[PDB]
C-alpha cells in the first residue's frame, strides 16, 4: 500500500479523462508530516523524489550532466542539491541555480533569473523546483502561467539530450500548459506526489526519456484539470516511511552509451533504445555555462 512508497504517481486512467478545471480542495490541506529527527522537509521531499526516479528507466551515463533550477532556499543553502548529489553517481556534473544567492554543493552555481542562464551543452537530467511566491496572490481564473515555465519549456526543447529526463515542480496554480504538452515528447511521463508533502497540491511532472518529437498529443489545459481531479478525489495520507530505508537509494551507474547522431539517423531502433533508458544522444564536449550580466551606471 501507498504509505510505504516514496509517493504516488497519477494513475493512467486519470490521464485519459477530459476534465474541466476545478478548484483544488484537499482533505488534509495544511497537515504536516512527522519527519525524522532533524531532517528538513526539502531533504525528505527530494529524497522521496529520487527514490521514485530510481524506479524509472533513467539514462545514467558516465560524466552525466544534471542541472537543478530553483535550488536556493530562504536559509541560503541548497538542501535539494545535497540530496541530488548524494543520489547521483560520484563525479556526476551538477549545476544549480536560483534567483537568490545561496551556497551549494553543486560543481557550479549561477545566481539570477533562470532566463539569464545559458549553455550550449545538452543535459541528461533537468530538475526544477522553481515557484513564484506571487502565485499565492490568486485573483482570477487559474490559467497557464508563463514566467520561468516558458524558459523551462525552451530549455527542454533546446538543451535536453535525447534519452534525458526531467522532473519539474508544479502546484494547483503554478503550472503551464505547454509543459504538459511537452510531457508527450517523452517515452513516458507522470505527475508524482511525494508522500511527505501529500497534503499539498505540489507534484513533480516527470518526463522519462526524451524523444525530441511528440509520441502523444497532450492538451495541457485538460491534463492539468485531470491532475487536479485526481488529487481532489484521491486523498493521499502523509507518510515519511520510505525515508528510513536508504539501502537502495543510490542511482545505479548504468554506464549508458552516449552518441552524437544527426536528425536523419534517429530511426525506430534508436528511438527504442532511447525509450528504454539505454541511450543518450548529444555532444560530449566540455560543459560550459554562463549567466547574463546587465551593465549599467547609475551615477548622474
Amino acid at each position: 500500500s501507498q504509505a510505504w512508497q516514496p509517493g504516488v504517481a497519477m494513475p493512467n486512467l486519470y490521464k485519459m479523462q477530459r476534465m474541466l478545471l476545478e478548484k483544488c480542495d484537499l482533505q488534509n490541506y495544511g497537515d504536516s508530516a512527522t519527519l525524522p529527527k532533524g531532517i528538513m522537509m526539502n531533504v525528505a521531499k527530494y529524497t522521496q523524489l529520487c527514490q521514485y526516479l530510481n524506479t524509472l528507466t533513467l539514462a545514467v551515463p558516465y560524466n552525466m550532466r544534471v542541472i537543478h533550477f530553483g535550488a536556493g532556499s530562504d536559509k541560503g543553502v541548497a538542501p535539494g542539491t545535497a540530496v541530488l548529489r548524494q543520489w547521483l553517481p560520484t563525479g556526476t556534473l551538477l549545476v544549480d541555480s536560483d534567483l537568490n544567492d545561496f551556497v551549494s554543493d553543486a560543481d557550479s552555481t549561477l545566481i539570477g533569473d533562470c532566463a539569464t542562464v545559458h549553455t550550449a551543452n545538452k543535459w541528461d537530467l533537468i530538475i526544477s523546483d522553481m515557484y513564484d511566491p506571487k502565485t499565492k496572490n490568486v485573483t482570477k481564473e487559474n490559467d497557464s502561467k508563463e514566467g520561468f515555465f516558458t524558459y523551462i519549456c525552451g530549455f527542454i526543447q533546446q538543451k535536453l539530450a535525447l534519452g534525458g529526463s526531467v522532473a519539474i515542480k508544479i502546484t494547483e496554480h503554478s503550472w503551464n500548459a505547454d509543459l504538459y504538452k511537452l510531457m508527450g515528447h517523452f517515452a513516458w511521463w507522470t505527475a508524482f506526489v511525494t508522500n511527505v508533502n501529500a497534503s499539498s497540491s505540489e507534484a513533480f511532472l516527470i518526463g522519462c526519456n526524451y524523444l525530441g518529437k511528440p509520441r502523444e498529443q497532450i492538451d495541457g489545459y485538460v491534463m492539468h484539470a485531470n491532475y487536479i481531479f485526481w488529487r481532489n478525489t484521491n486523498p493521499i495520507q502523509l507518510s515519511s516511511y520510505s525515508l528510513f530505508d536508504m539501502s537502495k537509494f543510490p542511482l545505479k551507474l548504468r554506464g549508458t552509451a552516449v552518441m552524437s547522431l544527426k536528425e536523419g539517423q534517429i530511426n525506430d531502433m534508436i528511438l527504442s533504445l532511447l525509450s528504454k533508458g539505454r541511450l543518450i544522444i548529444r555532444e560530449n564536449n566540455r560543459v560550459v555555462i554562463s549567466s547574463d550580466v546587465l551593465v549599467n551606471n547609475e551615477n548622474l
Binding site: 531532517i39 528538513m40 531533504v43 543553502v77 548529489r85 548524494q86 551556497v103 554543493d105 525515508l243 536508504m246
Partner: protein
C-alpha cells in the same frame, strides 16, 4: 599590512560567549552503516554519526568569506561531512575545531585509532 579578518577565531569566541551555533546545516538521510570517515564523496555516517552536506557546514561558505588557503579551495563543498551525533548541534564548530587524520581519514579524537 598584516590585517586579516579571523572568522574562525570570531566564531570560536562567539560560541564561548554563549552564542547559538550556526543552524540550517543540511542533514542527510542515510543508512548509518558507512565507514565513519570524516569527509566523503557520499554520506558515510556510522551509527554514532550524522552526515551533512559539506558546504552548509563550512564557516567560510556560510559566511561568504574567502577560504583560508592560497588557492581558496574548500575541503567540504561538494562532499559530505560526518559529525558525531553528540556534536551535531554545531556542525560548523565541529569542522572548524577538529582535524582529519591524513592516514585513515577518521576525525582525530573521534574515530582515528592510528595512535593506539
Amino acid at each position: 599590512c598584516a590585517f586579516a579578518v579571523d572568522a574562525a577565531k570570531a566564531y570560536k569566541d562567539y560560541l564561548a560567549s554563549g552564542g547559538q551555533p550556526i543552524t540550517n546545516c543540511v542533514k542527510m538521510l542515510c543508512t548509518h552503516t558507512g565507514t565513519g570517515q570524516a569527509i566523503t564523496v557520499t554520506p558515510e555516517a556510522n551509527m554514532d554519526q550524522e552526515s551533512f552536506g559539506g558546504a552548509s557546514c563550512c564557516l567560510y561558505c556560510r559566511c561568504h568569506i574567502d577560504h583560508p588557503n592560497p588557492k581558496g579551495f574548500c575541503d567540504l563543498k561538494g562532499k559530505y561531512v560526518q559529525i558525531p551525533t553528540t556534536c551535531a548541534n554545531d556542525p560548523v564548530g565541529f569542522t572548524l575545531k577538529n582535524t582529519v587524520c591524513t592516514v585513515c581519514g577518521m576525525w582525530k579524537g573521534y574515530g582515528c585509532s592510528c595512535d593506539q
